[PDB]
Amino acid sequence: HMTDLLASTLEHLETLVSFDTRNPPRAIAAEGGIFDYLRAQLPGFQVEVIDHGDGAVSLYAVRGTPKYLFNVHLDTVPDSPHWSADPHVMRRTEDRVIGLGVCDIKGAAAALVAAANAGDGDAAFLFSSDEEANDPRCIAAFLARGLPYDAVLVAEPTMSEAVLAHRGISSVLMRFAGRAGDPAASALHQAMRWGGKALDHVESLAHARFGGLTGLRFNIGRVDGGIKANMIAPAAELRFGFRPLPSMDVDGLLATFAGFADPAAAHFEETFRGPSLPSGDIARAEERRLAARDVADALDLPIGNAVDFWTEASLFSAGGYTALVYGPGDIAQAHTADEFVTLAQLQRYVESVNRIINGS
């Protein structure tokens, strides 16, 4: 099954995918490349490209006097391991397309561009390029401009359903150092004791709940230290993260985790922190969530369940905007070899945003 709108989405997507926007290394320039392309695909829009430096670039486009803002990040995660073909050459099958970023989240960008070219309805787009890694600058810079919008829809794969809430996120780098001057002699033994305490604590929060989400997702994703079995390891590196539910005290959680290290870790560095969606006290979280639900209803979008993954909708929400996450595709395909998004998902999403933008 094909439609002109879907055909156009696929054409734009093929081009978008061909642009290397992997982050890291986030070698994205304001001039040339993907942004020069988008500049020529937004008829009737007032367009501005802002270079925030080091690959953090934004394209803000406005046509008419839209009440809603669509934000879509253009960077993708790195490719491989195991891609069966060039990640930057979109492939197509009977029911889906394959390519780096087709699911997260260039598919949404392609659909929005298709809609922009299928009618001249009011619309506002904010294409950023730094969502996938550290040192983000785009959204923070945009928020500082204080531009009014009734709501902001941030694109991420949500199976084309409006998501109103999601967990926050924290990533931490820890380094343990042996104390020759002793049960703390080994950095690995220290890491082991720390880990036990951390996991036990996570278990104690298992009953916390929010919109179907339960407990605290916690993960020790990397441990590296030592040389040989019987040689005492003087150093050990450990990286962990957790995804708080809205209203959880993240500052307190981080300090609690840090305090489990005895002696103190030689290094304890939170490399990234993202707020939950919505964020704040439970009362604020529910009020904000309901405001987002009302917007989804107004735009006739099916409401999906809260998700565990993080998105920048959290930033807009913390900034005072009613915000929701909405995009084609399944998060299951995000950051996977031969990443794909179904034509069905692409069609549903493009028809929806075209309706919002150009529909009667």
Interface residues with a second copy (CB under 8 A) are 169, 171-173, 186, 188-189, 191-193, 195-196, 199, 219-233, 236, 239-241, 243, 271
The count of other CB atoms within 10 Å of the CB of residue 149 is 17
Q: Say how many residues touch Co ion, by CB under 5 A.
A: 3
Pairwise CA distance, residues 149 & 169, whole Å: 26
- Looking at residues 75 to 104 of the shown chain, list those that interact with Co ion (rule: CB under 5 A): 104
Of the candidates 327, 335, 326, the one whose C-alpha atom is nearest the C-alpha of residue 13 is 327
Residue 131 bears catalytic tag:
yes
Give DSSP secondary structure letters for 245-299.
PTT--HHHHHHHHHHT-SS--SEEEEEEEE--BS-SSHHHHHHHHHHHHHHHHHT
Q: Judge whether 73 is annotated as a binding position.
A: yes
Pairwise CA distance, residues 250 & 316, whole Å: 19
Q: In what order do the strands lie in the sheet with 96-98?
A: 91-92, 96-98, 340-342
Query: 88 is in the binding site of which of Co ion, a second copy, none (Cβ under 5 to 8 A by kind)?
Result: none
The residue written with tokens 């401009």 in the block is: 145
Give me 41's structure tokens: 């695909």
Query: 222 is in the binding site of which of Co ion, a second copy, none (Cβ under 5 to 8 A by kind)?
Result: a second copy
Q: Which of 14, 131, 132, 161 is catalytic?
A: 131
Query: 192 is in the binding site of which of a second copy, Co ion, none (Cβ under 5 to 8 A by kind)?
Result: a second copy
Query: 323 is in the binding site of which of a second copy, Co ion, none (Cβ under 5 to 8 A by kind)?
Result: none
Phi, psi of 94 (to 5 degrees): -60, -30
- Binding to Co ion by residue 109, rule CB under 5 A? no
Distance, CA of 10 to chain centre: 23
- Looking at residues 140 to 159 of the shown chain, list those that interact with Co ion (rule: CB under 5 A): 156
Closer of 149 and 309 to Co ion (Cβ): 309
Closer of 181 and 221 to a second copy (Cβ): 221
Closer of 68 and 242 to a second copy (Cβ): 242
Q: How far is the CB of 188 from a second copy (least distance, A)?
A: 5
Name the residues annotated as catalytic: 131
Numbered residues of the known binding site for Co(2+): 73, 104, 156
